[PDB]
Design a protein around this nucleic acid. Structure first.
Ligand code: MG
Ligand code: MG
Ligand code: MG
Ligand code: MG
Lengths: 55, 82, 55, 96, 121
RNA sequence: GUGCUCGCUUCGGCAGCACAUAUACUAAAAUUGGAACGAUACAGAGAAGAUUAGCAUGGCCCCUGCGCAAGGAUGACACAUUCGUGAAGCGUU
């Protein structure tokens, strides 16, 4: 067991955001049936987040 | 009641004495009349061995072995959609 | 005797415990030896309490 | 195969369970209550309370500050992090 | 990765190992239909009729909706010559009230033999 | 072994009785096979061109640590052209 902590918080929040989106949407979006763009949809996520950081 | 029993065992760790002499009567499965002196049964007095209170944990538990493996039946696309 | 047995138990042959409970090292230590030889507060606390009683 | 290891956190604490009391709001009271009436009357009371509560001969410019009554920008809550009024205030304060 | 490993041991005719690989793969993901087809296929290639029979039964039991399993199962029995067996399978299959095509295949099955009364039924 | 039988009865022996009731990983041994982070030897730090700060994720990988703390190299580990077979099922000429 490991306890959330200051060193780990930013990593933690993004970890469980990637998981939040992954579970939600791949249990939400589907019918690709094979693998639906999980790597890709998440890359769209990080891309969008960078874009909003760059305005 | 059942849960409480279980809990007490777990809690035994947190709180670091047994005195029962208990007898048992045994029937073997070999028999044959020359196997014992010549008794269909034997009797054994079971005694719990006394543990040395300053004895450290004897042996090492850390070792790790991969999780073990039937699925219930499930019972539950257009080109354009694809 | 306890503390020497602990020391030996771990094969720390380059430490030396004297009779007034000062834990010293025999030789200048190698990096690896230094890692392995550290005791935590539990051992040192015990050692110092014993020192007090020996006084 | 249960380890003799321990930890500080694990030790006893709050071994007693605080059961709710009668004035705290034991389930007995709750079962008997007609909540709907209570909720209505409280609501009414709240409403009532609310009701009770409520020269220079020379210049470029004639008055700019005519009808400028603040506006409800701090009454609007906005679900948008960069256009919330809180964010504006923060941005105003900390950058030069 | 699972499949390639299974295939390699199959090629060396170490099929007991292969079986264990397939079972382990199934433990990971029992829903994967390619996996099951490769497993049953492997048994059939090595003439292990009864193993294959077991496997087919499992596949249709746990993933009844997969029509590929049913079509292959009946085909295998037909090839083996066991018309009765195939009929039994199809009767099980029909309990799931499947798809127009499945019913057609059952009827056609009957019509490869005279069995017109059966077909009509 | 101790005591007692107005025991046989001398002071020796013998008898009766009472009390007293099951130690111990027996070895002061013999054998049997994993580890030292020793030296030596070879080789030589993740991320992008380089130099580096790091938190993480996963567990037939651990170590230090009382620790649900923190460290161990971020501990290590993580390597644009253009189609057709073969079989089966279904409907049709
Ligand atoms: Mg750090
Ligand atoms: Mg560094
Ligand atoms: Mg670390
Ligand atoms: Mg790491």
């Amino acid at each position: 067991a490991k306890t959330v902590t200051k060193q780990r918080v930013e990593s933690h929040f993004d970890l469980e955001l990637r998981a939040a989106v992954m579970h939600d949407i791949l249990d939400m979006m589907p019918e690709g049936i094979k693998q639906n763009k999980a790597r890709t949809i998440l890359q769209h996520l990080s891309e969008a987040w960078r874009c909003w950081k760059a305005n | 009641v059942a849960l409480e029993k279980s809990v007490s065992q777990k809690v035994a760790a947190a709180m670091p004495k047994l005195a029962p002499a208990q007898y048992i009567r045994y029937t073997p499965s070999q028999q044959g009349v020359a196997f014992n002196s010549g008794a269909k049964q034997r009797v054994i007095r079971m005694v719990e061995m006394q543990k040395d209170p300053m004895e450290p944990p004897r042996f090492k538990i850390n070792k790790k072995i991969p999780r073990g493996p039937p699925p219930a039946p499930v019972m539950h696309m257009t080109v354009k959609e694809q | 005797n306890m503390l020497n047995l602990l020391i030996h138990r771990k094969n720390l042959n380059y430490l030396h415990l004297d009779y007034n409970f000062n834990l010293k090292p025999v030789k200048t230590l190698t990096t690896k030896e230094r890692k392995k030889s550290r005791f935590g507060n539990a051992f040192h606390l015990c050692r110092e309490v014993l020192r007090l009683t020996k006084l | 195969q249960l380890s003799k290891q321990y930890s500080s956190r694990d030790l006893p604490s709050h071994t007693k369970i605080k059961y709710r009391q009668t004035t705290q709001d034991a389930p007995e009271e709750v079962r008997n209550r007609d909540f709907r009436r209570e909720l209505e009357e409280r609501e009414r009371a709240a409403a009532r309370e609310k009701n009770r509560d409520r020269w220079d001969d020379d210049v470029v410019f004639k008055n700019c500050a005519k009808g400028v009554d603040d506006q409800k920008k701090d009454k609007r809550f906005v679900n948008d992090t960069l256009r919330s009024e809180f964010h504006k205030k923060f941005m105003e304060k900390y950058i030069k | 990765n699972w499949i390639k490993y299974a295939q390699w041991e199959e090629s060396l005719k170490e099929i007991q190992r292969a079986r264990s690989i397939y079972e382990r793969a199934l433990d990971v993901d029992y829903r994967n239909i390619t996996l099951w087809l490769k497993y049953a296929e492997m048994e059939m290639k090595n003439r292990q009729v009864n193993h294959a029979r077991n496997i087919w039964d499992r596949a249709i039991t746990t993933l009844p909706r997969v029509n590929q399993f049913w079509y292959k199962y009946t085909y295998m029995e037909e090839m083996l010559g066991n018309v009765a067996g195939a009929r039994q399978v199809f009767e099980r299959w029909m309990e799931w009230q499947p798809e127009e095509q499945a019913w057609h295949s059952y009827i056609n099955f009957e019509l490869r033999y005279k069995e017109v009364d059966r077909a009509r039924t």
